Structure formats: structure tokens, C-alpha cells
Amino acid sequence: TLLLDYGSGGRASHRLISDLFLRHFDNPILGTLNDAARLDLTGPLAMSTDSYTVDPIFFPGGDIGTLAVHGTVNDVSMLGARPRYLSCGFILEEGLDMDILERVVASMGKAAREAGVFIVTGDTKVVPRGACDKMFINTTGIGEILVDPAPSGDRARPGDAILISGSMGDHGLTILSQRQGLNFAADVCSDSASLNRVVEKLVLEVGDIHVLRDPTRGGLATTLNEIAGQSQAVCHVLETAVPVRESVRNGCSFLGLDPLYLANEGKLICILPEERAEAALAVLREGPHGEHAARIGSVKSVGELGAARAGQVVMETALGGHRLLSMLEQLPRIC
């Protein structure tokens, strides 16, 4: 149903753009249909881009459209910014079921509305059969930075608490189990969700936020390694304090997966001084998936425990020992 014609730039192209994309994204900035969108924005801005390649396109709790909006809304938010405007670049396979496209577009429209964001400008490329697997989406986000200094990977400092906003491993498990035709529990679905509202309240009401990051590819373990490395410190984490749903733990062990390295799509790590930790945690409890928000550890200077060097992540194990959480070695198209 998606003919090559829709990517040629002619009459059918313009029809798809007006009748589908504009209809769902509905705003007068996009409606302009010019070579660029005109934006009125305040000053220090945050900009992020991500392409989305998730297989399958549809899964419990989300889809590629939901990922395309939430993930980019989230990345902009990690710099302590208020996301305002997104662009979307579709890459589509000739022959694609058109209802797949409309469902994905509908998901994006809905997600953007819920996040208080508009899709202001776009692109649509249709490639011949076989040139791509159904559909990829790139989204780029632009937002207004809310604080100075703003959160940054290099700002974790000794004595900081490390907070998590909810359960680990859910998204990664659900796509990997979907892809093998397995449903472990009703309990197991993607956590794809927008975190801009929790971040705004953290940054403006709690304050002094050092680091925000979303544990997507590589999971909690490789975002903690990134932060430890950028901040030249060591992250100490308590295994029992990292929330992982029983059903996720059980699904992960059945598939030989580690929930600490599986991509999440509706979660953040928040690092900040100890005296603000309790207030931040109170806020995280009210954010998406916040039933399971928790203090999971702390930041320490090199040689403080120790022997762990700058950039290392050490987990105190449930058995009373330790495990070094190093970066991976995999798990394709989980987002």
C-alpha cells in the first residue's frame, strides 16, 4: 500500500504529508509547510537527536512512534531543559502496510500532546523493497535550559546520592521476548514514557541536580560507567536496592539476560548532593513508573572504599560481596 510514489516528492508525497502527518501532529508551526519551521525560543537551549530501529515495531506498552517521541523528549530533559519542539524524519520501505504507518503516526501525535511538545518539521523518505526493514524514525528535540549550572555527565561529585526513577530491564525484556513469541507475564511491558514533567519539578523545585541520564542502550550499568568516567569518580551501587520486577528477573534468567544491562525507555538516573536526595526521591515517586523509585547508591572519590579507579562502577552484591559492573561486549534493535 505504501508505493514508491510517496517518496518521489510529487503530488502523492504532498498528500501523505497533509492528510496523515499534519492531521495527527496538528499545529500552525508545522502547518506552514515550508523548508524549515520557525521557532521562538529562549536563549540557552538543549538539542538531541536519536534514530529508532526497534524490532518489532509494536510491543506491549509501546511502539516505534512512542519510542521516537518519548526517547527524544527524555534526552532533551537530561540536560535540565524543557523540551518544546521535535522534528521527525521517516525512512520507509516500499510495500509497507499503510495502517502500520498510521498507527505509528497516531502514537507520535498522542505522545507529543501528552509531553506538551509539538512536531514542527519533518521528512519522509520511501526506499525500494528490501532497502530497509519496514521503518526507521529519527527525531530531534529542542528545549529551553531551565537552570545554571545544568545537569551534565561530568558533574557527579563525592557524597552524591544515586537515585533511580523505577524498575530496570522491562523494555529490553519485552522486545526480546516478543521477538521470540514469548509472553512471560502481563507484568512485563515496555516502560516507554515521557519524563520531562518529573525533570522540570526536580530541577526547579528540588534544585542542585548534578546528573540526569536515561539508561537506554547498555542499561543502568553502562550509563553509570559513562557518568563515573565523565566525572572521574567511582559509583557504588547496592544490588538489593536496584528495583527489578520478579517477573522481569525470572524472564531475564530464563533468557540468559542481565536486567542491569538491558535498555530502558521510561527511566532516569538522578545524581545530586545528599541533602537534596530525599526531596528528589519524593518527586521521583510521583513520576512515571515511580512506584519503584529508589536510592541505589552513592558517588565516591578514588580510593575512598576502595581500590576501584576513576570510571569504575562497583556493586555491593546481595550475597555480601562485590561485582564490578563493566561495559558490554549483542542485543540488536532493542530501540
Ligand X SMILES: Nc1ncnc2c1ncn2[C@@H]1O[C@H](COP(=O)(O)OP(=O)(O)OP(=O)(O)O)[C@@H](O)[C@H]1O
Q: Which residues bind ligand X (CB under 6 A)?
A: 9, 17, 21, 25, 30, 33-35, 50, 71, 75, 88, 90, 119, 121-124, 216-217
What span, in angstroms and rounded, lies between the C-alpha atoms of 283 and 201?
7
Question: In whole angstroms, how close is the CB of 325 to its own copies at the nearest point?
Answer: 12
The interaxial angle of helices 246-254 and 170-178, nearest 10 deg, is 50
Considering only CA atoms, which of 328, 194, 216 is closest in space to residue 264? 216
Structure-derived torsion over alpha carbons of residues 236, 233, 219, 112, reported in degrees to the nearest 10: 120
Q: Could you say which residues in the range 205-264 bind its own copies, by CB under 8 A?
A: 212-214, 216-218, 222, 226, 230, 263
Among all chains, which residue has been given the C-alpha cell 563515573? 228
Q: Could you say which residues in the range 131-160 bind its own copies, by CB under 8 A?
A: 131-133, 136, 138, 140-143, 145, 150, 152-154
Selection from ligand X, Mg ion, its own copies, none that 60 binds (CB < 5 to 8 A by kind) is none
Taking the alpha carbons of 241, 242, 243, 246 in that order, is the dihedral positive or negative?
Answer: negative
Amino acid identity, position 285: R
Q: Is residue 121 part of an annotated ligand binding site?
A: yes
Q: Is residue 66 part of an annotated ligand binding site?
A: no
How many Cβ atoms from other residues are within 10 Å of residue 158's Cβ? 13
Member of 1, 18, 39, 274 binding its own copies (CB under 8 A): 39
Question: In whole angstroms, how close is the CB of 240 to its own copies at the nearest point?
Answer: 25
3-state DSSP call for residue 7? helix
Q: Which is nearer to Mg ion, 75 or 200 (CB)?
A: 75
Find the helix or strand (DSSP H, E) in which 329 lies: none
Report CA-CA distances (Å) from 284 to 87, 195, 261, 291, 315.
28, 10, 22, 9, 22
Q: Is residue 240 part of an annotated ligand binding site?
A: no
Selection from Mg ion, its own copies, ligand X, none that 301 binds (CB < 5 to 8 A by kind) is none
Under the criterion CB under 5 A, does residue 50 sit at the interface with Mg ion? Answer: yes
What span, in angstroms and rounded, lies between the C-alpha atoms of 326 and 118?
38
Q: Could you say which residues in the range 2-41 bind Mg ion, by CB under 5 A?
A: 35
Q: Is residue 295 part of an annotated ligand binding site?
A: no
Give Rg (Cα) of the chain.
21
Question: In whole angstroms, how close is the CB of 321 to Mg ion at the nearest point?
Answer: 31
Member of 200, 214, 239, 265 binding Mg ion (CB under 5 A): 214
Under the criterion CB under 8 A, does residue 43 sit at the interface with its own copies? Answer: yes
Selection from its own copies, ligand X, Mg ion, none that 150 binds (CB < 5 to 8 A by kind) is its own copies
Under the criterion CB under 5 A, does residue 63 sit at the interface with Mg ion? Answer: no
Considering only CA atoms, which of 20, 11, 3 is closest in space to residue 96? 3
Q: Is residue 26 part of an annotated ligand binding site?
A: no
Residue set of the binding site for ATP = 34, 121-125, 216-217
Known binding positions for Mg(2+):
35, 50, 75, 123, 214
